[PDB]
Amino acid sequence: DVLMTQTPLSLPVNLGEQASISCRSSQSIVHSNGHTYLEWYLQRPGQSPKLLIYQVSTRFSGVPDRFSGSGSGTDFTLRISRVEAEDLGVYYCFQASLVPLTFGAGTKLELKRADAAPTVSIFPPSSEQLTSGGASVVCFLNNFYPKDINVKWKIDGSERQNGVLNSWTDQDSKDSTYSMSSTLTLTKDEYERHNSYTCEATHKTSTSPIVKSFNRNE
Amino acid sequence: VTLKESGPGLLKPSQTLSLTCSFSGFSIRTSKVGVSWIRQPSGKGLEWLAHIYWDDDKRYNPSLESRLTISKDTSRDMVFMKITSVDTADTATYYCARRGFYGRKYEVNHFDYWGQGTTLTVSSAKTTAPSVYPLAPVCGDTTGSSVTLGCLVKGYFPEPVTLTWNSGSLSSGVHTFPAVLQSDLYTLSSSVTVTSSTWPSESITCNVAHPASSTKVDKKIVPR
Ligand code: NA
Ligand code: NA
Ligand SMILES: [Zn+2]
């Protein structure tokens, strides 16, 4: 099938700067009729997708001229000459030449800002939850930039990948940072077998692991 | 030109999803446009499902085709989609998109109008009120100039809940995270960060309302 590969998947810009998004198809997407059905769609937060560019390089009605498309065969590029607030959102390339019609993974056009280290806080299970037989440990990692972060739970020094639920906020509309919550859910009995609980983050703002821990008995 | 999708909102696994896209402002019959269904699974990008052309020819995504049936009723100006045997992974926003063109260079076609979408959640759960757990730090994490408290809202169905701190009087320093579906139920969390001179000397409580279960609960964050 035709795989559509977009690069990059996240694109931080300053408003007023140029943006370029690459879309590479796994084979030629020229239809037998000689048309290249390569389209670019923008989905802004809270909205449905909207057409920007069709047939590689043609702007749809109502689309500002700061949007342009180019490419041939298997290599395509969307450019925005001067990025506006209303351009922020997720861009998808789409090929309709071959069935299944396929979309790229999306490129999130977001805002650049200076790096910011997360404020990391860890929380033991509540007595209320323990009485019902469960035990969730929660780690918040707040107000960081860039969005790239690796978060690992360790219980008595061993990584725990199972039982985890993560959630993330959108880029903050005022300070442009990101926040994350990670919850590791265990049984009460498992929680009470173990001693040391650790939320370990890797982020470009620290040369070493950012660690927050507690002991069940402290 | 307007498109509007409708569907069941919630289904239990194994059920058949029946979607309708209702068109106005133009005739499906006359225009010769095609129509597709496209979905956006939770946490994912867009995925094309099926297409119906003016002449009722049909194309499907082979990843899902065995479960899909697209159809049309031009007299009602409606296009339909059936998806059999739904399960969790079908939780998505479903969009109808018109495959238009400038009239009438038929070869130069593209998705020019999209509906607002219809949301589907697939879960075996009945309506289930949240368990609301206050998150207090260990004592050793209360010695700085600020302190972060939290609230964990676990195991509810369906969305939404509303969460506030001190009935909305505590609004700065708050991060409330999007709900996530897991094992048929939603979990949400929220943190609030205050000066150490604010808590525990002043009480801080998370308030959680879940309209579907007619529940409202307050949980004071007690120091450990
Ligand atoms: Na264990
Ligand atoms: Na042609
Ligand atoms: Zn392939």
Tokens coding A194: 């173990």
Residues A106, A131 within the same domain: no
Residue A147 maps to which CATH number? 2.60.40.10
Cα–Cα distance list, B104 to A37, A40, B98, B214 (Å): 17, 22, 15, 54
- Examine the fold and report which residue of B124, B141, B164 is the final residue of a domain before the chain moves on: B124
Residues B100, B158 within the same domain: no
Residues with CB under 5 A from ligand 1 (ion): A 190, 193
Residues B117, B165 within the same domain: no
As a whole number of Å, the end-to-end CA separation of chain A is 56
Measured between CB atoms, which of A132, A138, A218 is closest to B150?
A138
CB pair distance less than 8 Å for B46 and A49: yes
Q: Which residues of A touch B182 (CB under 8 A)?
A: 165
Residues B166, B118 within the same domain: no
Domain with B193 in it: 125-223
Report how many domains make up chain A. Answer: 2
Closest approach of B211 to chain A, Cα-based (Å):
22
Closest approach of A64 to chain B, Cα-based (Å):
16
CB pair distance less than 8 Å for B191 and A43: no
In this structure, chain B runs to a length of 224
Q: Which residues of B touch A96 (CB under 8 A)?
A: 110
CB pair distance less than 8 Å for A35 and B108: yes
Show the DSSP H helices in chain B as ranges: 28-31
B13-16 CB contacts, 8 Å cutoff, 24+ apart: B13/B86, B13/B87, B13/B88, B13/B122, B13/B123, B13/B124, B14/B85, B14/B86, B14/B87, B15/B86, B16/B82, B16/B83, B16/B84, B16/B85, B16/B86
Domain with A164 in it: 115-214
- Examine the fold and report which residue of B124, B151, B182 is the final residue of a domain before the chain moves on: B124
Measured between CB atoms, which of B48, B133, B188 is closest to A128?
B133
Q: What is the DSSP string of B188-223?
A: EEEEEEEETTTTTTS--EEEEEEGGGTEEEEEE---
Tokens coding B131: 């368990």
Residues A145, A56 within the same domain: no
CB pair distance less than 8 Å for B139 and A126: no
A26 Cα to the center of ligand 3, angstroms: 7
Residue A98 near chain B (CB below 8 Å): no
Report how many domains make up chain B. Answer: 2
Residue B6 maps to which CATH number? 2.60.40.10
